Design a protein around this ligand. Structure first.
Ligand SMILES: *[C@H](O)[C@H](C[C@@H]1CCNC1=O)NC(=O)[C@H](CC(C)C)NC(=O)OCCSc1ccccc1
Ligand SMILES: *[C@H](O)[C@H](C[C@@H]1CCNC1=O)NC(=O)[C@H](CC(C)C)NC(=O)OCCSc1ccccc1
Lengths: 306, 306
C-alpha cells in the first residue's frame, strides 16, 4: 500500500515572477524582486580574495548604485536600474526604479525547526527546480543547491499570501545547506563567510515522527500501536538523552488523534520502542523513523484538510 | 553526509497558467487550456449512476457545447465558451472561443517506466501543489491525489518546451494512481471505469537503482563496490526471477561511470548482493534499495549536468 504521501511543494509561479539576476563585480547570483526592492545575499559584493573574511561594512560603503546590475530574464524581461542600496544583516536591499508588476501578496517570516517550506532553486536568475524541505533542529536544510544557487528563496503560503522565510547562502561540510531569513539573520549560529564552521548535531523531529506514525494508522498500518503510553513530560525527558526534539502538540496533531482514535501518548511510547529497533518490520515501506513529513502534510495529503 | 538529492520538480508557473475548471452536469474537475483547446478526462460527462460502466460513445453524443462550463480562476481570469467538443480515447478535447494567451511551447509525449515527471495537483481549476514521481513498471505512480484532482497534469521540460505526458484519472486499490497520455490512452492496462481492476506487480527499476548507487559513490559512500562484476546479460536473466526490471544503459548512466571510475557491471553485482541483504549497513541513509531517482537526476543534482 502506497501511503499517499509525496514531498509536496507549493505551485511556484507567483515566486518565479519575482526572480532576477544580480551581478556585482566578479559575482553573480539571484535576487528577489518585490515592489521596488531587490533582495539578495550580501556576499555578491565580495571579491574572491576576501570570501573567507569579508569586511562587509567597508564593502557596502565601497559600492555605488552603478556597482549592481539587475536583470530579469524569464517572463516579462526587464533591466532594472538600481537607485539605492542598503544592508540588512546578511542581505542587501537594492532599491530599483521599476516596481515589480507581478508582486504577489507577501510577508516575511522565520521558519522553525521541523516546519516545512518550499524552495525555488534558481541559477543566473532563471528558476530551474522546486522542492520542499523541513528546517532541521540544527538550522540546516537537506537541499539540492550548486554553485550559483545563492539568492534562491524558500517560502510558505497561507491563502494567496506568500510568506518568504529563506534566502540561500551556503553549503555546510556535511552537504546540508543554510541561509538567511529576510530580517537578515542567518538561521542558527552560521556566518556568511567562506570558512569551516562548527555545525550542531541534528536530531529527530519528534512531532513529525508522530505525524508519520499517524499517517501509517490512516493507511491501515498500526501494528506498532499498543495500549501502553508515555506521557509528554516523560517522553521529553527521554528525548533529551536520545537525540530527539522535545514534543510539543498542536491542533494539527490533535486532529490526527481524533481521526484515528489513537492517543499521542500511545505513539510517544511506540517511538521509544521503534528507536530500539523495528525488529524486521516495516512502517509505510520504511525500516527507520521518518521525520520529514509534518502534521500539516498528513492532514492535507491524506485527510484533505488545509 | 546529506546526499544532495531531493525530489526536484520543474518550476510550475508555465503550466499553472494553463489550468482551468471544467464542469459538466454533476461533475467538476480540471482541464488543460492550450491554444483554443481544453483537454480534460472524459468521465466529467459521466452521471454518478453510470460511473462503473459508462457508455462514453453515447454520453458524447448526448452532449452539446452548452453541456460544458469552463472557467479560469487564478491569474488572468476568464470564462471560456465551448464551441466544439470531441473525444480522443479517455480524454475530451473541447474547443473554446479564446486562445490561451499564455500557451507555452509544448509537445505531447508518453513517459516510460522508470522515468520521472512533474505533477501539478489541482482542485476546481486551482493549482494546489507540485511533486515529482517516476512511472512505475506497472504503469502506476505513487502520487498524492484526492477527490477532485482529475485533470491534474504531469509533464517534463526540455529547454523552454513543456512535454505533457500525464492527465490524472484514478486511484488504484493499493493507493497508487494512474491516468492518461494526451493521445487518450490510459497508461498500462487500466480502464477509466469505477470498477475494481487487476493491478500488475511492481518491480524495482534497475537503472534507477544503479543511478542511486552512483550517487552514493559521488558522495564518498562506496563500501559496496567490489572488483566483482555481473554482465548486463547475466543481470537481466537474474532480474526476471527477482522482480527487477531489465537494465538498459544510457549515456546518462555512462557519464556517471566515467565520473566515478566504477563500471556498471560492478554495480549490477552490488545490487544482487544488496538484494540479499544490507547486513546492517546503510547507503545514503537507507537500508533498502532506492529506485526513485533517475540517472538524469543524479547527473543534474550532484554533477551539475543537464
Ligand atoms: C552561493 O551560490 C553559494 C552556494 C553554495 C555553492 C555550492 N552549493 C551551495 O549551496 N554559496 C557559497 O559559495 C558560500 C559563500 C560564502 C557564504 C561567502 N560559501 C560556501 O558555501 O562555502 C562552503 C565552504 S566554507 C564553509 C564550510 C563549512 C561550514 C560553513 C562554511
Ligand atoms: C477524479 O478526480 C478522481 C481521482 C481520484 C479520487 C480519489 N483519488 C483519486 O486519484 N477519479 C475517480 O474518482 C475515478 C473515476 C473513474 C475513472 C470513472 N474513480 C476511481 O478512482 O475510483 C477508484 C475505485 S474503482 C477502481 C478500483 C481499483 C482499480 C481501478 C479502479
Amino acid at each position: 500500500h502506497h501511503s499517499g504521501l509525496v514531498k509536496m511543494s507549493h505551485p511556484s509561479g507567483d515566486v518565479e515572477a519575482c526572480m532576477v539576476q544580480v551581478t556585482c563585480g566578479s559575482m553573480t547570483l539571484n535576487g528577489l524582486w518585490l515592489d521596488n526592492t531587490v533582495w539578495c545575499p550580501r556576499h555578491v559584493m565580495c571579491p574572491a580574495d576576501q570570501l573567507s573574511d569579508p569586511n562587509y561594512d567597508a564593502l557596502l560603503i565601497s559600492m555605488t548604485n552603478h556597482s549592481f546590475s539587475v536583470q530579469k530574464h524569464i517572463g516579462a524581461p526587464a533591466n532594472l536600474r538600481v537607485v539605492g542600496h542598503a544592508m540588512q544583516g546578511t542581505l542587501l536591499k537594492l532599491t530599483v526604479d521599476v516596481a515589480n508588476p507581478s508582486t504577489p501578496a507577501y510577508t516575511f517570516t522565520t521558519v522553525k525547526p521541523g516546519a516545512a517550506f518550499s524552495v525555488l532553486a534558481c541559477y543566473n536568475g532563471r528558476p530551474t527546480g522546486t522542492f520542499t524541505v523541513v528546517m532541521r533542529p540544527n538550522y540546516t536544510i537537506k537541499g539540492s543547491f550548486l554553485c550559483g544557487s545563492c539568492g534562491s528563496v524558500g517560502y510558505t503560503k497561507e491563502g494567496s499570501v506568500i510568506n518568504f522565510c529563506y534566502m540561500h547562502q551556503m553549503e555546510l561540510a556535511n552537504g546540508t545547506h543554510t541561509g538567511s531569513a529576510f530580517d537578515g539573520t542567518m538561521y542558527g549560529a552560521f556566518m556568511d563567510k567562506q570558512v569551516h564552521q562548527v555545525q550542531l548535531t541534528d536530531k529527530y523531529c519528534s512531532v513529525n515522527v508522530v505525524a508519520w506514525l499517524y499517517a501509517a494508522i490512516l493507511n491501515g498500518c498500526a501494528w506498532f500501536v499498543k495500549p501502553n503510553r508515555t506521557s509528554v513530560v516523560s517522553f521529553n525527558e527521554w528525548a533529551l538523552a536520545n537525540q530527539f526534539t522535545e514534543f510539543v502538540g498542536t491542533q494539527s496533531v490533535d486532529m490526527l488523534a481524533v481521526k484515528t482514535g489513537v492517543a499521542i501518548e500511545q505513539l510517544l511510547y511506540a517511538i521509544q520502542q521503534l528507536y530500539t529497533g523495528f525488529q524486521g518490520k516495516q512502517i509505510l515501506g520504511s525500516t527507520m523513523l521518518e521525520d520529514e513529513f509534518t502534521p500539516e502534510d498528513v492532514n492535507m495529503q491524506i485527510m484533505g484538510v488545509v
